[PDB]
């Protein structure tokens, strides 16, 4: 005997949601009232709803549990969209409650009329309009279940008037927490795979976030067959610690070693991955892909053998079927290549007379940050530096907009994080473009008392300078940001602001920002690091290729792009 | 290496498709040429593309293997839509190749311009436009995989010009047939379920098509705990043979027994089901749902415990954890109720002085049809009669538009069937509305040499006559079909036509139609059977409920709707 | 001949676009290069793309000419969406260039994959994906034309690779500026209307933005038949100056006079309007609607006579057919009622001992602002105050998100404005929620050297406090903003910041902010003004009505909502 909104709120509480991120409107009165009368779920008001979505995503990513955000009708919920894409593409359980204009006015071009039911189709698993209160029990049941079990976004579109109507009287608000099933491939499929591996000399693994929770099984497997392990970016935090077979990552921002490893493998085995750079994959090697989601299978390479399976349970069952290989010439050669590849990683990662090198900053961040710190990195150079310098260990974490690829993710994701783990240290490696893109929500660290440690890579620019040639006469209005003082801004927002201009000052700023009890923004003025490009590659680019689409990589030094050549590892 | 079309066709052949259903256009020349030069995949030309879709669905349903249909650009592929919905809603693997207008003209309101990429979003798991031939390998890989492994429709939209361009040279055409994984819930979840079952007295099962292939496990489980088994319509062919615990089906067209069984159960266990009639579900019983697809869970009832799981492997694991219950008072009372409920099923199922009773026809069809015949039934009364009279045995099959609920499915599905199993007997129980709705494709049984046995329930009407009161003054233009002679039409199409007007002639017509070597249409003139409705129910209907939404059922006799009353069973 | 991007850019230049608002990406390299090599169109880089859209809209609104914005692939262009809705709903010509992921990767879940072609359907007149460079000439031709002539948004979705390919060689880049036609209803329709008006005693007009450019014709017509003129908000700047028949506006934020005027009219004539509050319209009066867009006709009221027509040319033709009415008892009574209604408008609009009253601030803004200043107001209280206190005169202008109803519009629209009219004074009446919602783009007034005068109504809250009852125990996290100092923030961004806390200081701050040569943010701390609501109305609200949906208005004083009662006017 309650409102539809109340019914939703109570069901959510049973499912265990602790908070709902968003921004109020009249179209959400039903939900507000219920939330207030209930006093159990905390309303996290943000300054732009886009940040609410991002945060919810981060919260879900860290907690592993359903997270919720909401938006008023019209522009309210629409503001969620970019964030929801990030949630969805990052495979985290997020329910989004999109309040809607009053039923009666629908179809008449009413004030604020949008069609959320339609808009969010792409960034969701489920998206329905609750026209009649009678449908709330089944609509919500599915939405939640899919979001949670299919690992993604669900959207419930709820007109303000409907939300205030009485929920069905017989409806159950109790939620049964149904965990993922055990999904392992058939014994026959496994036996095939084992024969296949047994007949392959140079075996290689490309590992992604799908390998989370399976680290033990992963290394054991790799060890048993002496197969090197390359990882995709999102697999970094789950794979690149305690790993004797680590050959790093590849792609433009990784290291050549991983590429050469796959181009010299007889058999390449994709394990829970969506590594998207098709040109980095062997053309004439047997590619075997294991993944829990059929839609992943062959999205980015050919597949000679595909197995639907949970990486953990699959490897558990596969191990007894795979005999120990003793030959490790391939593995050793790879490891060697990777060590040789991190040559020059240190080149610019040191204190400097003039401008501060980004790589130095990143190196120091990884050094002084907590051994269990949660990092976030803006899409832009912070993502490059975060991926190359942050040392993972299986306690620390790394969030970013790695699949949806949105600027300005770093701080908003950081809010989400901090709120979920208020005891833990959260470090946002932000761009100055990205920090300013959603700068309003900086005010949220104060208002929400969330002690995130923002570190802006203040380079007064959007991305690597001179994507071709340093320009002494040309200056695209596109890449140039007006010299700004974010420490000064942090200060005027009621947050500790540390401005850093000399390399000598870095270690001090970081150490202090981390130990201070509260929000700190560390405005570090870094160099406008350039990226030299071979004229041969500039040529390819004009045909319609980005550096990500070419067989090209950023050097360990980080100041130029070089062609990956065919390297046949001697017989 | 070849054309994009050829690449597709060859990949399909590797995956083992034997035929592609559709209707040619210039927009499909690439595909035609390739198909012709290849000579391996048979092009099944239909008269309306809608039937190609339907057929493909039936082919997929029977074979359990990927099936394909295609349509020209514009109206061509659009004609598929209704059929594709049926394929999709029936959970069968179907790839639809939707030819598209020439790239260049897109966006200009060209001759035949539609946007297939958008239109089929709802009836599909995957829907993409192949703009550049470069994307065909990954687009097709995903489409096929999803279609096959997620059990549904995928759509590839392919402009005629793109189809003629060269496929990527490095592309692999070999397909690895990856089977479904073994998906069973965790041991702890199972233990909970077992303890739950162990402390329940009156346990009941509602079983759906998800139980296919698990008949042995099903009965054993039901037997062990002495739990009666009600089935949903689509579970009929997989559940209602060799089943000591059979309590029939419910819903408007079933029998009361199933309803009373659930309303008197302490614990109700949904096994692979999507039975949609929410009012037929117990309000105050523990509902436990097992299903392979999280989106199914709680779609139509509350769920106190939900388990993601394959019904077969789940029951295999659950059995050793469930101790044998000896008390079977509940089971026995149910069985009794069901036998008591098929009272009057025979009432009208006998030869008659005047018009021929539909129930008689159906009874006789089930009697003279092959012991392994494949049936199909039009949405309409043929669905009612097919469900009540066809005796299943685990060899026979039953296809219909049970979820998408489209008229005129019977014959087109029948074509699909016959083509997949040319040795087998296929019987289409068609409505006269449904047979005429896509009557053009009757010409396809000739042209395709497919010996389907059409049986039209010629009642000169759309559905049950007098959904309220026989009208001696009123006659809605809505329900009345102009007296037609389909035997005569069959004859003029080059197909054996048997006209049947006297009950005495039925057994002879059927026996002959089945034994003749080829297509036979049996035009049976059946009664305009009425459906009396209590004035109390007519009242409810005016509030906005159909008979499916009420706690109401059709009598065993089949000539009136009666309210299901609350029934309590002693001890 | 050149690249597709260049082709676009050059065509745009011919059409006369002066700038393109957005934020760069690699997916826009083609467009960047062309823009740079061309040096004619200025790239206005914003901090969030949402603001680029908003601005473009404001630029289009002011200039009356096509305006353009653009976004990178994926999150880039998606950031435009909310703004584009505002552009579209405000009926302004805006082309949006949405860069897209590389063709080849489409359909594979590539990095940043979205489907812009679909997403923007709702906020646009035209939305197409340029797959082949061959289609750019017709796609762009239509997009531009529709955008311009149908007065709304068009979207061209352009993959980065396609943009770099050669445009069709034969393509014309010259644009013919085709002006709107003369659209007047047929003489017979006009004669009917004239006879209708001739036999009506109490005639009333409700006028909207459609009346722009027709002020002379409007008053003359109203004068001739002695008909009072109520206006909709968006008609304000075009109607409420030099108007002897002005009866103000209605709706929640207007004045009762307009409502009573229509409820006492025999004939009500809607002129170019989309006033959306259906409850404010007479039930028993002849409603006559004239509008240029058939979709407007009857959207919000019944229509006894509808005429498709341009308000200007229609009135020109209608005048000679309408004989002068001498009776003006109705008109006079209305005018009187309106003067009586602005009773209490002044109540709180004066210097105060304690907190500063918003109405005072607004009154003073209208007083010290330029006689031809361009205002903008955030959705929220600034919209209320802007509408009640800003005196229009036919030179000044007023922009807001009046139809799409988005927070945070004020400043971003203000940027657009200032850039289009760099000589003119632009005043953004911003909320503190709205200013902070897109606060990043505050950095744009510096970087773009745009001397907008921001005036924040710093009330530390979201909207009217206590939408029911001041809460001395309750405090919704929903409405409460953490006390912030925006003057201090303005300062740290390199912009003059004036903090204002005492009413006595207002006139000085305003006068100085306006005369200073450059950006000034005036952070005025205003009262948390309350809005008392009758318990009778709170009741109605719980049924599912907002104050906008009820026959209710905000008092002239502005501190409470009062029910509009039925009023009958003698003779
Ligand atoms: C600026 C920038 C540059 C980048 N450059 C690079 C680069 O050079 N190198 C690089 O690697 N990345 C790079 N990326 C990131 C890249 O876009 C992808 O995010 C990353 O490559 C994908 O990692 P993943 O496959 O682990 O991601 P995810 O999408 O997280 O992988 C999850 C996959 O595993 C499957 N899965 C999940 N759970 C299980 C399970 N239990 N069992 C089996 N399967 C499971 C899922 O179905 C899915 O397919 C870059 C990103 C940015 C922003
Ligand atoms: C005119 C008409 C009247 C009808 N009246 C009735 C009626 O009176 N009574 C009635 O019952 N129906 C009736 N229906 C049919 C009804 O609409 C449904 O189609 C049917 O009831 C549902 O059957 P189902 O649950 O087996 O459906 P399906 O959709 O076939 O059920 C499959 C479910 O099992 C799951 N599943 C599949 N494979 C597995 C697996 N390996 N492991 C675990 N789970 C799996 C799927 O996720 C899905 O949820 C009628 C239809 C028509 C056209
Ligand atoms: C917080 C808030 C509160 C609000 N409260 C109120 C309120 O109390 N009162 C109020 O009035 N508004 C209010 N509004 C605004 C309201 O939502 C509408 O935006 C506004 O009322 C409608 O103005 P309009 O009819 O001029 O709109 P528009 O959409 O600008 O009207 C244009 C109409 O005229 C037609 N037209 C255009 N050109 C021509 C032509 N040449 N010839 C003929 N026809 C043409 C168009 O087809 C269209 O139908 C509020 C807005 C906000 C944000
Ligand atoms: C919303 C959005 N707009 C544009 C892009 C394209 N893009 C990617 S990185 C980048 C520059 C990022 O600048 P900044 O935040 O300053 O980080 P930097 O690379 O300079 O460290 C742009 C414009 C994007 N990925 N997302
Ligand atoms: C395309 C379509 N139109 C309408 C309906 C609704 N409908 C269901 S059964 C039916 C009558 C079917 O008539 P017929 O084929 O004669 O079967 P009968 O019940 O008469 O045997 C209609 C119109 C539907 N399900 N599908
Ligand atoms: C994006 C968005 N979110 C929510 C709303 C609903 N809404 C309308 S006004 C408002 C408060 C605006 O606050 P502020 O900017 O402080 O203006 P004030 O009324 O406080 O002056 C909200 C949340 C909206 N219109 N748009
Ligand atoms: Mg930067
Ligand atoms: Mg019939
Ligand atoms: Mg405010």
Short mmCIF file of N, CA, C and O in Angstrom, two decimals, chain B residues 255-330:
data_model
loop_
_atom_site.label_atom_id
_atom_site.label_comp_id
_atom_site.label_asym_id
_atom_site.label_seq_id
_atom_site.Cartn_x
_atom_site.Cartn_y
_atom_site.Cartn_z
N UNK B 255 -6.52 -26.44 -19.19
CA UNK B 255 -7.47 -27.02 -18.26
C UNK B 255 -7.26 -26.48 -16.86
O UNK B 255 -6.13 -26.18 -16.46
N UNK B 256 -8.36 -26.38 -16.11
CA UNK B 256 -8.38 -25.81 -14.78
C UNK B 256 -7.38 -26.48 -13.85
O UNK B 256 -6.78 -25.82 -13.00
N UNK B 257 -7.21 -27.79 -14.01
CA UNK B 257 -6.35 -28.55 -13.10
C UNK B 257 -5.01 -27.85 -12.79
O UNK B 257 -4.63 -27.72 -11.63
N UNK B 258 -4.30 -27.40 -13.83
CA UNK B 258 -3.02 -26.74 -13.64
C UNK B 258 -3.09 -25.50 -12.76
O UNK B 258 -2.21 -25.25 -11.93
N UNK B 259 -4.14 -24.71 -12.95
CA UNK B 259 -4.35 -23.52 -12.14
C UNK B 259 -4.55 -23.86 -10.67
O UNK B 259 -3.88 -23.31 -9.81
N UNK B 260 -5.49 -24.76 -10.40
CA UNK B 260 -5.78 -25.19 -9.03
C UNK B 260 -4.55 -25.81 -8.37
O UNK B 260 -4.33 -25.64 -7.16
N UNK B 261 -3.74 -26.52 -9.15
CA UNK B 261 -2.52 -27.15 -8.64
C UNK B 261 -1.53 -26.11 -8.11
O UNK B 261 -0.94 -26.29 -7.05
N UNK B 262 -1.36 -25.01 -8.83
CA UNK B 262 -0.45 -23.95 -8.40
C UNK B 262 -1.03 -23.12 -7.25
O UNK B 262 -0.31 -22.70 -6.35
N UNK B 263 -2.34 -22.89 -7.28
CA UNK B 263 -2.99 -22.13 -6.22
C UNK B 263 -3.06 -22.93 -4.93
O UNK B 263 -3.45 -22.41 -3.90
N UNK B 264 -2.69 -24.21 -4.98
CA UNK B 264 -2.67 -25.04 -3.78
C UNK B 264 -1.28 -25.56 -3.47
O UNK B 264 -1.12 -26.53 -2.72
N UNK B 265 -0.27 -24.93 -4.05
CA UNK B 265 1.10 -25.35 -3.81
C UNK B 265 1.73 -24.41 -2.78
O UNK B 265 1.45 -23.22 -2.76
N UNK B 266 2.57 -24.99 -1.92
CA UNK B 266 3.39 -24.22 -1.00
C UNK B 266 4.54 -23.64 -1.78
O UNK B 266 4.88 -22.46 -1.66
N UNK B 267 5.14 -24.49 -2.61
CA UNK B 267 6.27 -24.09 -3.43
C UNK B 267 5.99 -24.39 -4.90
O UNK B 267 5.62 -25.52 -5.25
N UNK B 268 6.15 -23.38 -5.74
CA UNK B 268 5.97 -23.51 -7.18
C UNK B 268 7.31 -23.29 -7.83
O UNK B 268 7.96 -22.28 -7.56
N UNK B 269 7.73 -24.22 -8.68
CA UNK B 269 9.05 -24.14 -9.33
C UNK B 269 8.97 -23.98 -10.85
O UNK B 269 8.67 -24.93 -11.57
N UNK B 270 9.25 -22.78 -11.34
CA UNK B 270 9.25 -22.54 -12.77
C UNK B 270 10.53 -23.10 -13.38
O UNK B 270 11.62 -22.74 -12.95
N UNK B 271 10.39 -23.99 -14.36
CA UNK B 271 11.54 -24.59 -15.05
C UNK B 271 11.55 -24.23 -16.53
O UNK B 271 10.70 -24.69 -17.30
N UNK B 272 12.51 -23.40 -16.93
CA UNK B 272 12.60 -22.94 -18.30
C UNK B 272 11.27 -22.50 -18.88
O UNK B 272 10.76 -23.12 -19.80
N UNK B 273 10.69 -21.43 -18.33
CA UNK B 273 9.39 -20.99 -18.81
C UNK B 273 9.19 -19.49 -18.87
O UNK B 273 9.84 -18.70 -18.19
N UNK B 274 8.23 -19.12 -19.70
CA UNK B 274 7.92 -17.75 -20.04
C UNK B 274 6.39 -17.72 -20.16
O UNK B 274 5.82 -16.85 -20.82
N UNK B 275 5.74 -18.71 -19.53
CA UNK B 275 4.28 -18.73 -19.42
C UNK B 275 3.93 -17.35 -18.93
O UNK B 275 4.39 -16.92 -17.87
N UNK B 276 3.11 -16.64 -19.72
CA UNK B 276 2.94 -15.19 -19.61
C UNK B 276 1.71 -14.72 -18.84
O UNK B 276 1.55 -13.51 -18.67
N UNK B 277 0.83 -15.63 -18.42
CA UNK B 277 -0.44 -15.18 -17.86
C UNK B 277 -0.34 -14.94 -16.35
O UNK B 277 -0.57 -15.84 -15.54
N UNK B 278 0.03 -13.72 -15.98
CA UNK B 278 0.41 -13.43 -14.60
C UNK B 278 -0.68 -13.79 -13.58
O UNK B 278 -0.37 -14.14 -12.44
N UNK B 279 -1.94 -13.72 -13.99
CA UNK B 279 -3.04 -13.99 -13.07
C UNK B 279 -3.18 -15.46 -12.69
O UNK B 279 -3.94 -15.79 -11.78
N UNK B 280 -2.47 -16.34 -13.40
CA UNK B 280 -2.58 -17.78 -13.16
C UNK B 280 -1.55 -18.27 -12.17
O UNK B 280 -1.41 -19.47 -11.93
N UNK B 281 -0.81 -17.33 -11.61
CA UNK B 281 0.29 -17.65 -10.71
C UNK B 281 -0.11 -17.37 -9.27
O UNK B 281 -0.71 -16.34 -8.98
N UNK B 282 0.24 -18.30 -8.36
CA UNK B 282 0.00 -18.18 -6.92
C UNK B 282 0.59 -16.91 -6.34
O UNK B 282 1.74 -16.55 -6.64
N UNK B 283 -0.18 -16.24 -5.50
CA UNK B 283 0.27 -15.01 -4.84
C UNK B 283 1.03 -15.35 -3.56
O UNK B 283 2.05 -14.73 -3.25
N UNK B 284 0.53 -16.36 -2.84
CA UNK B 284 1.06 -16.74 -1.53
C UNK B 284 1.70 -18.12 -1.56
O UNK B 284 1.34 -18.98 -0.75
N UNK B 285 2.62 -18.35 -2.48
CA UNK B 285 3.40 -19.57 -2.46
C UNK B 285 4.83 -19.16 -2.77
O UNK B 285 5.05 -18.13 -3.41
N UNK B 286 5.81 -19.92 -2.28
CA UNK B 286 7.20 -19.65 -2.65
C UNK B 286 7.39 -20.01 -4.12
O UNK B 286 7.24 -21.17 -4.51
N UNK B 287 7.70 -19.01 -4.94
CA UNK B 287 8.00 -19.25 -6.35
C UNK B 287 9.50 -19.29 -6.59
O UNK B 287 10.23 -18.34 -6.33
N UNK B 288 9.95 -20.43 -7.09
CA UNK B 288 11.35 -20.64 -7.42
C UNK B 288 11.48 -20.77 -8.93
O UNK B 288 10.79 -21.59 -9.54
N UNK B 289 12.32 -19.95 -9.54
CA UNK B 289 12.48 -19.97 -11.00
C UNK B 289 13.91 -20.33 -11.41
O UNK B 289 14.87 -19.72 -10.92
N UNK B 290 14.03 -21.32 -12.29
CA UNK B 290 15.31 -21.68 -12.92
C UNK B 290 15.22 -21.37 -14.41
O UNK B 290 14.28 -21.78 -15.09
N UNK B 291 16.20 -20.65 -14.93
CA UNK B 291 16.18 -20.30 -16.34
C UNK B 291 17.58 -19.93 -16.83
O UNK B 291 18.40 -19.40 -16.08
N UNK B 292 17.84 -20.20 -18.10
CA UNK B 292 19.15 -20.00 -18.68
C UNK B 292 19.36 -18.53 -19.02
O UNK B 292 20.50 -18.07 -19.17
N UNK B 293 18.27 -17.79 -19.11
CA UNK B 293 18.31 -16.39 -19.52
C UNK B 293 17.79 -15.44 -18.44
O UNK B 293 16.59 -15.43 -18.14
N UNK B 294 18.67 -14.63 -17.83
CA UNK B 294 18.25 -13.79 -16.70
C UNK B 294 17.04 -12.92 -17.02
O UNK B 294 16.23 -12.68 -16.13
N UNK B 295 16.91 -12.47 -18.26
CA UNK B 295 15.78 -11.64 -18.65
C UNK B 295 14.42 -12.34 -18.53
O UNK B 295 13.38 -11.69 -18.61
N UNK B 296 14.44 -13.66 -18.35
CA UNK B 296 13.21 -14.43 -18.21
C UNK B 296 12.75 -14.38 -16.77
O UNK B 296 11.57 -14.53 -16.47
N UNK B 297 13.71 -14.16 -15.87
CA UNK B 297 13.49 -14.35 -14.45
C UNK B 297 12.62 -13.26 -13.81
O UNK B 297 13.05 -12.11 -13.65
N UNK B 298 11.40 -13.63 -13.45
CA UNK B 298 10.47 -12.72 -12.83
C UNK B 298 9.71 -11.88 -13.83
O UNK B 298 9.08 -10.88 -13.47
N UNK B 299 9.76 -12.26 -15.10
CA UNK B 299 9.05 -11.51 -16.13
C UNK B 299 7.54 -11.54 -15.90
O UNK B 299 6.83 -10.60 -16.27
N UNK B 300 7.06 -12.61 -15.26
CA UNK B 300 5.62 -12.86 -15.17
C UNK B 300 5.10 -13.30 -13.80
O UNK B 300 3.90 -13.53 -13.63
N UNK B 301 6.00 -13.41 -12.84
CA UNK B 301 5.62 -13.71 -11.47
C UNK B 301 6.66 -13.10 -10.53
O UNK B 301 7.65 -12.55 -10.98
N UNK B 302 6.42 -13.18 -9.23
CA UNK B 302 7.45 -12.79 -8.27
C UNK B 302 8.42 -13.95 -8.22
O UNK B 302 8.08 -15.07 -8.62
N UNK B 303 9.62 -13.71 -7.73
CA UNK B 303 10.57 -14.80 -7.55
C UNK B 303 11.23 -14.76 -6.18
O UNK B 303 11.94 -13.83 -5.85
N UNK B 304 10.99 -15.79 -5.39
CA UNK B 304 11.57 -15.86 -4.06
C UNK B 304 12.99 -16.41 -4.14
O UNK B 304 13.88 -15.99 -3.40
N UNK B 305 13.21 -17.35 -5.06
CA UNK B 305 14.57 -17.77 -5.33
C UNK B 305 14.76 -17.92 -6.82
O UNK B 305 13.98 -18.61 -7.48
N UNK B 306 15.79 -17.27 -7.35
CA UNK B 306 16.11 -17.38 -8.77
C UNK B 306 17.47 -18.06 -9.01
O UNK B 306 18.47 -17.75 -8.36
N UNK B 307 17.51 -19.00 -9.94
CA UNK B 307 18.76 -19.65 -10.27
C UNK B 307 18.96 -19.62 -11.77
O UNK B 307 18.13 -20.12 -12.54
N UNK B 308 20.06 -19.01 -12.19
CA UNK B 308 20.51 -19.11 -13.56
C UNK B 308 21.03 -20.53 -13.81
O UNK B 308 21.92 -21.00 -13.09
N UNK B 309 20.48 -21.22 -14.80
CA UNK B 309 20.91 -22.58 -15.06
C UNK B 309 20.24 -23.29 -16.21
O UNK B 309 19.06 -23.07 -16.49
N UNK B 310 21.00 -24.14 -16.90
CA UNK B 310 20.48 -25.10 -17.86
C UNK B 310 19.64 -26.15 -17.12
O UNK B 310 20.13 -26.84 -16.22
N UNK B 311 18.37 -26.27 -17.48
CA UNK B 311 17.48 -27.23 -16.82
C UNK B 311 18.03 -28.66 -16.72
O UNK B 311 17.88 -29.30 -15.68
N UNK B 312 18.63 -29.16 -17.80
CA UNK B 312 19.21 -30.50 -17.79
C UNK B 312 20.33 -30.66 -16.76
O UNK B 312 20.22 -31.47 -15.83
N UNK B 313 21.40 -29.88 -16.89
CA UNK B 313 22.54 -30.01 -16.00
C UNK B 313 22.20 -29.64 -14.55
O UNK B 313 22.75 -30.21 -13.61
N UNK B 314 21.28 -28.68 -14.39
CA UNK B 314 20.84 -28.25 -13.06
C UNK B 314 20.15 -29.41 -12.32
O UNK B 314 20.50 -29.72 -11.18
N UNK B 315 19.19 -30.06 -12.98
CA UNK B 315 18.50 -31.19 -12.37
C UNK B 315 19.44 -32.36 -12.12
O UNK B 315 19.29 -33.09 -11.13
N UNK B 316 20.41 -32.55 -13.01
CA UNK B 316 21.39 -33.60 -12.83
C UNK B 316 22.10 -33.42 -11.50
O UNK B 316 22.29 -34.39 -10.76
N UNK B 317 22.48 -32.18 -11.21
CA UNK B 317 23.23 -31.86 -10.00
C UNK B 317 22.34 -31.77 -8.76
O UNK B 317 22.77 -32.08 -7.64
N UNK B 318 21.11 -31.35 -8.97
CA UNK B 318 20.16 -31.15 -7.88
C UNK B 318 19.66 -32.46 -7.31
O UNK B 318 19.38 -32.53 -6.12
N UNK B 319 19.55 -33.49 -8.14
CA UNK B 319 18.98 -34.77 -7.69
C UNK B 319 19.65 -35.41 -6.46
O UNK B 319 18.97 -35.71 -5.48
N UNK B 320 20.98 -35.60 -6.50
CA UNK B 320 21.64 -36.18 -5.32
C UNK B 320 21.49 -35.35 -4.04
O UNK B 320 21.76 -35.85 -2.95
N UNK B 321 21.07 -34.10 -4.17
CA UNK B 321 20.93 -33.23 -3.01
C UNK B 321 19.51 -33.23 -2.44
O UNK B 321 19.26 -32.66 -1.37
N UNK B 322 18.59 -33.87 -3.15
CA UNK B 322 17.18 -33.84 -2.79
C UNK B 322 16.73 -35.22 -2.32
O UNK B 322 16.75 -36.18 -3.08
N UNK B 323 16.33 -35.33 -1.06
CA UNK B 323 15.94 -36.63 -0.54
C UNK B 323 14.55 -36.99 -1.01
O UNK B 323 13.70 -36.12 -1.19
N UNK B 324 14.32 -38.28 -1.21
CA UNK B 324 13.03 -38.76 -1.68
C UNK B 324 11.89 -38.49 -0.70
O UNK B 324 11.92 -38.94 0.45
N UNK B 325 10.88 -37.75 -1.15
CA UNK B 325 9.66 -37.55 -0.38
C UNK B 325 8.70 -38.71 -0.63
O UNK B 325 8.54 -39.16 -1.76
N UNK B 326 8.05 -39.19 0.43
CA UNK B 326 7.14 -40.31 0.31
C UNK B 326 5.69 -39.82 0.18
O UNK B 326 4.88 -40.41 -0.54
N UNK B 327 5.38 -38.74 0.89
CA UNK B 327 4.04 -38.16 0.84
C UNK B 327 3.72 -37.72 -0.58
O UNK B 327 4.43 -36.90 -1.17
N UNK B 328 2.64 -38.27 -1.12
CA UNK B 328 2.18 -37.91 -2.45
C UNK B 328 0.68 -37.62 -2.48
O UNK B 328 0.02 -37.83 -3.49
N UNK B 329 0.14 -37.15 -1.36
CA UNK B 329 -1.28 -36.81 -1.31
C UNK B 329 -1.55 -35.66 -2.28
O UNK B 329 -2.53 -35.68 -3.03
N UNK B 330 -0.66 -34.67 -2.27
CA UNK B 330 -0.76 -33.53 -3.18
C UNK B 330 -0.72 -33.95 -4.65
O UNK B 330 -1.56 -33.55 -5.46
#
